[PDB]
Design a protein around this ligand. Sequence first.
Ligand code: NAG
Ligand code: NAG
Ligand code: NAG
Lengths: 492, 492, 492, 71, 71, 71
Amino acid sequence: SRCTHLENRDFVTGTQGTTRVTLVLELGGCVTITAEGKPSMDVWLDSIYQENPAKTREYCLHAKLSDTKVAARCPTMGPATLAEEHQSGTVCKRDQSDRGWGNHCGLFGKGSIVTCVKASCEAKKKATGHVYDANKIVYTVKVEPHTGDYVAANETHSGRKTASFTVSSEKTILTMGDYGDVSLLCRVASGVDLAQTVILELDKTSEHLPTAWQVHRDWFNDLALPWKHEGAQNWNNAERLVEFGAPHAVKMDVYNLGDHTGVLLKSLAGVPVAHIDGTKYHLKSGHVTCEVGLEKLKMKGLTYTMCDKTKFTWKRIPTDSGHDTVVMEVAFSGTKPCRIPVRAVAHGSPDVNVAMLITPNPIIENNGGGFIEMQLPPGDNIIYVGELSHQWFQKGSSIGRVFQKTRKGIERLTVIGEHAWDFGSAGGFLTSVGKALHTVLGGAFNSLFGGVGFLPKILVGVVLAWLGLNMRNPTMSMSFLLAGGLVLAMTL
Amino acid sequence: SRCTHLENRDFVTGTQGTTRVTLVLELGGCVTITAEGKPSMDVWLDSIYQENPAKTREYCLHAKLSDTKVAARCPTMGPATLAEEHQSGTVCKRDQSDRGWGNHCGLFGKGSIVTCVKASCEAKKKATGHVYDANKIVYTVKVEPHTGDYVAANETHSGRKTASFTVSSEKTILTMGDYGDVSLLCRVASGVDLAQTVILELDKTSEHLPTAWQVHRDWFNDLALPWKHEGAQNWNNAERLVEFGAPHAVKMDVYNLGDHTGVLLKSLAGVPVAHIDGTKYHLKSGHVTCEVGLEKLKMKGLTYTMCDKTKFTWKRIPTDSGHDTVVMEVAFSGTKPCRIPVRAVAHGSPDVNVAMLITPNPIIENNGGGFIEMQLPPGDNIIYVGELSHQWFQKGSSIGRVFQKTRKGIERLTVIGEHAWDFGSAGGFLTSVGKALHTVLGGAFNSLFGGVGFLPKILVGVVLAWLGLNMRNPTMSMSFLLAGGLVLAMTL
Amino acid sequence: SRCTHLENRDFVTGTQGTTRVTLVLELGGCVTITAEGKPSMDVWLDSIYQENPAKTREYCLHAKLSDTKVAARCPTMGPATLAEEHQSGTVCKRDQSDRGWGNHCGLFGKGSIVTCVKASCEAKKKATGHVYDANKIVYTVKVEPHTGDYVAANETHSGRKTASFTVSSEKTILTMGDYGDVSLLCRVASGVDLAQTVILELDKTSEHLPTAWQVHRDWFNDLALPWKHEGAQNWNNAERLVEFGAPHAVKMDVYNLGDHTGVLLKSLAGVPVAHIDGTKYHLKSGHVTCEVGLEKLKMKGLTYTMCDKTKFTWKRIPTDSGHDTVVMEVAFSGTKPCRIPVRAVAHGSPDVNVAMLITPNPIIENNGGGFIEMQLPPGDNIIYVGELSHQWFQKGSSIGRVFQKTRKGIERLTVIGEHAWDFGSAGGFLTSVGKALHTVLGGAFNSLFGGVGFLPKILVGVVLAWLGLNMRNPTMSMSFLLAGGLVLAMTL
Amino acid sequence: VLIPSHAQGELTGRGHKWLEGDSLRTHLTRVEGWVWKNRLLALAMVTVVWLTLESVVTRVAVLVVLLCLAP
Amino acid sequence: VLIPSHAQGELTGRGHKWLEGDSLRTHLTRVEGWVWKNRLLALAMVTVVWLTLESVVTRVAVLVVLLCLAP
Amino acid sequence: VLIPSHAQGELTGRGHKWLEGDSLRTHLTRVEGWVWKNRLLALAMVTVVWLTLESVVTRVAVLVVLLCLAP
Ligand SMILES: *[C@@H]1O[C@H](CO)[C@@H](O)[C@H](O)[C@H]1NC(C)=O
Ligand SMILES: *[C@@H]1O[C@H](CO)[C@@H](O)[C@H](O)[C@H]1NC(C)=O
Ligand SMILES: *[C@@H]1O[C@H](CO)[C@@H](O)[C@H](O)[C@H]1NC(C)=O
């Protein structure tokens, strides 16, 4: 049961006869799939990476300046000119000095002056922007059967399976061993928007920094630095790291603005970190749409015998998972293998089972089993495992759980619904209408207010509310009602 | 395919039972004529030229002047005279000079003076006008089968067949090899309006200019430059390049206004270019109406077995053509010949072959085959070639494509004019009435408008709109109808 | 009497007790100073010139282009670049071309393309601007006494005197033999504006053109052509004679817009010509104010005997001059020197002389004298020289001469502008008021609508009239008469 | 691209002038030649103004404006 | 002397065209430069037209007409 | 994290220590860019405020103030 390790776990449920289930998988999240008569699976998107991306630009972070030269002219002797003005990799400026008898000219007045320096980029002071190729990125999905064995985060479950989806991938069959077989399919076209992502890499071996960052393409293209394309010989806009002092007689001075790394890193704030693993460049934020096929899964040990009721013992006592589920582990000491006599009752002992087992048909195997995961109705309950028993009090009210489930839905709804409304296993008659409305609403609310940001959005919403107070006639008030909906959407 | 090479191809199509389809083969464009149960063809017009078109008149752009001679007589004596006034091919002027005992006359006053110069054109500084002969103009039209072999623009497909059309030439039958015989008629009488058209040469074989321009008969006949007919020995109005100085004592200067060529080249701005290829004078704009006789083309290889699904490999993966088609190439290592098992499956309908192939019955043969082009509906699809596959997301939108087709139609009607009305087919009422009204209205409008120019269009529109606002009676509404009609038509 | 050789003679007249006359000498004019009891003087500004003015700019009139090169990149391979983009004297352009599998790229889309040519000015096709220096320009004033021996314009008078003026100069004393001394003071700072003037020259060797033109500084500075200062090796804005055709797939064509000289020569059409005499750069328009101290002029020959009336004969019979003035020459065969008895007696009125002699105290000498100039009353006259007589008829009319003289005053006001008040000025309060009014009006009208030119000034004047045709209040009704004055100021 | 002229009245003086007469009246020629092309429209345009501007005097100003705008 | 611009006159369609866009643009650059040098007088005449009102569209019509009539 | 801009203190007005005084005017490219990026919304605000307000100066000054408050 991997996904006990992880906040942002989701549950999905299939009816009897449910054969194929749509999901949206995302990094830092997991789906526990359950269905009637079928073993449960934990499914998650492990990693989004590409080997050897292409690259877009290099930016310079610290200029090296050298070979300052100056030329000047008396006030009527026309423009001063330097031979270096046309050499590649130089920064120049032209200006007017003041001249007179005191500078060995004939005339008092203004006289032309020009200055140029060689400009280069300091060793290991470049930023490189890498970009993805839609045909080569790999979407790695992993699946684990709920075998009822527990393993830590620094252990590997014996039955973990992996598929590596790509544009060439078609559809994958994963042999789960005794649990049968799962069909799995994922649409890379539905993945991250590879167009708008740039992987900003700084030069190597910085110990106390991220290895790379994931940044917006237009922001990266708007950096205020000298730049060149891959393999180009010289830096464009090299003047951006240089300033020229005011001219003074025949003399003019050049000031290096120094290392701009600090203003970059201070500008890289609120920005998701990325990762690099040798040649593999990984994202850390993204999602994919997949289509899990429960057709051929089956359950181990439905013919196994019932265990001895007397021989159980708690190894891990019932405790709260923080998902409103109870997790536990029993040792067993009889002859094996056998089915674990799990049941639970509400207090007053009506002898009606209220255990929602997430673990299918719990079994003690010849060398494994005994972990159990349950959901229970609110209030006072008694859990039983054979004769072994434990009083449990379940915290939240039913209306509280309903609200919390809606809050989880809303929490995912911004990220997933902006990608796709249909997380909820194709409630299609409702879901398609909701998707259409949300699509056109997002179209409006993004074409307007696009890039405005939450605070300026809200401020303009308040301006529109004041216009509401200024609406002379009912139709104008309807236009305010539209602005009300806008300002609500932006405040939410 | 050729038409892949061009940003401007039209997918004319015909149902089963369709024959003798009608095209209007705009130069600088291509037609992919696809017919159910028949081989697809690419058809286009490759050249419009005439060999050695006759010439109208010549201008000179830089005068050579020589033998300046002057005579003058005292004020009471009489008029000054030169024989160089009668010896034709000179430029001359008579004027009056102040004279007196300052200049050895007997009496003060104004006395007659005459000046003459010989004039001729500078070497290779002529310009020349040529005019097409409606019974010697030649058209050429090329057809190429969709064999499923790709061929770059610097290579020649083995099925590229050329027809040459002269108005004396009846229906032409071209044997497309195994696919059978296509036939054409391309009656030259639908060509460009040769009466409007003059070709302007500049006599030099300049290394950095277009070799000729195409210009309207009026503008070329209006030029304010000295001119002659071919083989006439001397220039008329040569004075247009010669400006006399003001008289002074017994003397007048003659000043030469120098080379006009930069003026002419700048005044040409806006004009269509042409080309000269030895003796052949090619236009670079036009069209012709072709009947295309498809009735004898036949499919190739409907009786071959399928290929083995296993052995296909992507030589070139599916990629967007920019024409909203998917273009791809496979290579196959099995025995030959065999039929390619192409399919495309929509996400919504896993059992439906949605692939609308442009290529007919795609075949592998001992030296060719395996290039494929298809069209797909917007959204998410998986292309297959037997076992080989590729996820394709068709980026367009149905309404967007229809709107783009309306834009194409508007463009065609603008550039072609009335002939556009009978593109594709006779089209019954809508086409014939549209042609009739468009011809009548466009003829009357061009009769009023011809030469008025852009800013005068805007001026007249604004004037008519202002009058429509100002004036009283109901007929002014019709004037506004004219005002809007002109304004939008001219602004579109 | 040099001034007889010109059309535009002027007369200036002094009573007894005339001292320092003020003149405005004008280039191409000539002033006859006359005074009671003194010899008359011709005075004129002979020439204005400077040796080797400083070159302000060169402009190029015909670019040579060579070494065309091109580089291009497939749609994602970033900017194409050339080493030529940085060098001196290269013109380059960057653009995009449509590329795809038709030209061996992998992607359909817009490739990057760049092209460069060397651009250099062809041979002699340069225009050079020169600027005068107030410290070095020399104004040459000449003076000639009315000694009464005639000479043609083709021959040099025996007593012509030259003064050269510069900032180094002072009251200059010219000794004219027995006619005494004359004092010239001329204000170099009162001459032409040396900032507003530029001499433009082309190839001086051009057989049928003037050597130079006296253009205005702002026009020459706003010329569009490629330009550089003297000695600079590389043309700024060299692209302005070059243009690049639309990108084909992997090519851009480059075109030379040809010899601009005809455009420049046409644009000159407003301009007064100038002149170059080896090193001496001469102007052909301008004026200087001068003060001519008459006080030491001396009458020659008042002690001589009267000539014998018997012995005159005509060397040149009387004639009009077009200055409403009669000129003649007599021979003599008595002993000499002597004083010529010249008189004129109107008709039928024998005792009233009417000979207003302009050549004073006429004398005949060994190889000298004998030429006489006088002005006469309109109508019949008899001219006598001793016993020699001629029945001159003086055409014209009494009021006609007054009208002609006052019209010349308007011509003077038109061509001089402000300074016309100085001409003939012996100081007077009314003249000072006139100069004040003219200076304020000229300052307003030169600032308001300065450089607007006559047709746009007509436009603005009539617009200002229209804006006053029928108006709400008289409070700005002056505007219509100001417009009338503007029209009058426009008219001339 | 283009070289403008400059006003005839700027420097003046009595010297010989290059193309002295060509600065002004020549500009009328393009208008007359324009009329000789436009004529059907031109008379129509005139009559359009003439019929609408029954306010007589402003006919002249309007048609002068139109003719001077006419290339 | 003068040669008229053909730029619109042939109305011809698809192909390759000499110097097309700068032909249209340079007229506007002429008006922009004339306005730029005028702006003192232009603003004065603007306020003079403000002394008048048949309509604001008349005001802008007269201003545009004047700026197009002059270079 | 923030460093306060010295122009708020500007301990002597005689100073010449950087370009930055002119650069502050270049920083109006923030407002102008916000204008250029949102012209249709600005024109919307224009069309709104030009119609909704009766006062004439506020129909400039308020929009100016809002565009200067926009970052
Ligand atoms: C996993 O971590 C625990 C605690 O850090 C440690 O006792 C155990 O040995 C680790 N096992 C592995 C395989 O790293
Ligand atoms: C066509 O162009 C390609 C450019 O890559 C070249 O390799 C090939 O040899 C050319 N073929 C012909 C026939 O020109
Ligand atoms: C002009 O003057 C020269 C000498 O200065 C003389 O020889 C010649 O005869 C003169 N010209 C005429 C036409 O007499």
